[PDB]
Amino acid sequence: QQVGDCCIIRVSLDVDNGNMYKSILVTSQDKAPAVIRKAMDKHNLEEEEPEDYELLQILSDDRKLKIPENANVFYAMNSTANYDFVLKKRTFT
């Protein structure tokens, strides 16, 4: 469908309540650590690396999903849901 294949996802940080929800475009080969590079540069959180951050997709108002380091975001997200993404740190949890 269409030339290539890309979409815009919404990325919030691991905060709690509403925040500075950022938005970025993802392409077929879009890797977890890639989406994070964008989302991170956006949030000015160079303090840490991309590798130290989980990519989570939010489906329901409680049901979240997890994206591996190379799962083509375009193909690793719950389509039936919304393109909402959380950037979480790989803290001791």
Swiss-Prot record:
Coiled coil: none annotated. Residues 5-92 form the Ras-associating domain. Phosphorylation of Tyr-21 by MET blocks HRAS binding. The modification Phosphotyrosine is found at residue 21. It comes from the Eukaryota. It is found in: Cytoplasm; Nucleus. Functions as a guanine nucleotide exchange factor (GEF) activating either RalA or RalB GTPases and plays an important role in intracellular transport. Interacts and acts as an effector molecule for R-Ras, H-Ras, K-Ras, and Rap. During bacterial clearance, recognizes 'Lys-33'-linked polyubiquitinated TRAF3 and subsequently mediates assembly of the exocyst complex. Interacts with RIT1 and RIT2. Interacts with OOG1. Interacts with TRAF3. Interacts with HRAS. The Ras-associating domain interacts with Ras. This is Ral guanine nucleotide dissociation stimulator. It comes from Homo sapiens. The gene is RALGDS. The chain holds residues 794 to 886 of 914 of the full protein.
